[PDB]
Design a binder for this molecule. Structure first.
Ligand SMILES: O=C(CSc1nnn[nH]1)c1c[nH]c2ncc(Br)cc12
Length: 167
């Protein structure tokens, strides 16, 4: 028994709720929150900017030190950094950005990173401003992640579409 509340159960291990990921993290303080990162860990917009803003830019400061030491992530890759005031840890995961021409087949590789963590609060990867179809991202999530994932979908209209079209 964990502390996530109000989620709709999609499968054995995948749950979904119409929620702002920042407001969710602040309320639950999960072990792992997933960031929709880019390879440079430049948190300007979407999940990344909202989480980063909620950390008063501490996420960006930590991220810039990480990149200066390690160089960029791979598309499909991840790193574990601090969760600051939002979570114990933040798993920064790079899904492909369709709006930049990256291979959508890398979305499965991106979701595989979730399997290294027993429980995660996470957004749908590669959707929103990354330009891929959210219905597809949810399907890949369900078909790839085996650990317990709590998906926060910001847009109420999209949430209803995702639930109603879920197979
Ligand atoms: O932008 C995205 C990804 S795309 C999407 N996911 N659900 N609807 N659209 C966000 C996901 N969670 C968020 N929380 C706060 C803010 Br600000 C933005 C998002």
């Amino acid at each position: 028994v964990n502390s996530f509340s109000g989620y709709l159960k999609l499968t054995d291990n995948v749950y979904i709720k119409n929620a702002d990921i920042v407001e969710e993290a602040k309320k639950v303080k999960p072990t792992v929150v997933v960031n929709a990162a880019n390879v440079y860990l430049k948190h300007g917009g979407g999940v990344a900017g909202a989480l980063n803003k909620a950390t008063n830019n501490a996420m960006q400061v930590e991220s810039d030190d990480y990149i200066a030491t390690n160089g960029p992530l791979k598309v499909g890759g991840s790193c574990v950094l601090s969760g600051h005031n939002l979570a114990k840890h933040c798993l920064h995961v790079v899904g492909p950005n369709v709006n930049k021409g990256e291979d959508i087949q890398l979305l499965k590789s991106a979701y595989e990173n979730f399997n290294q963590h027993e429980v995660l609060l996470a957004p749908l990867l590669s959707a929103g401003i990354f330009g891929a179809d959210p219905i597809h991202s949810l399907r890949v999530c369900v078909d790839t992640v085996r650990t317990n994932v709590y998906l926060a979908v910001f847009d109420k209209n999209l949430y209803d579409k995702l639930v109603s079209s879920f197979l």
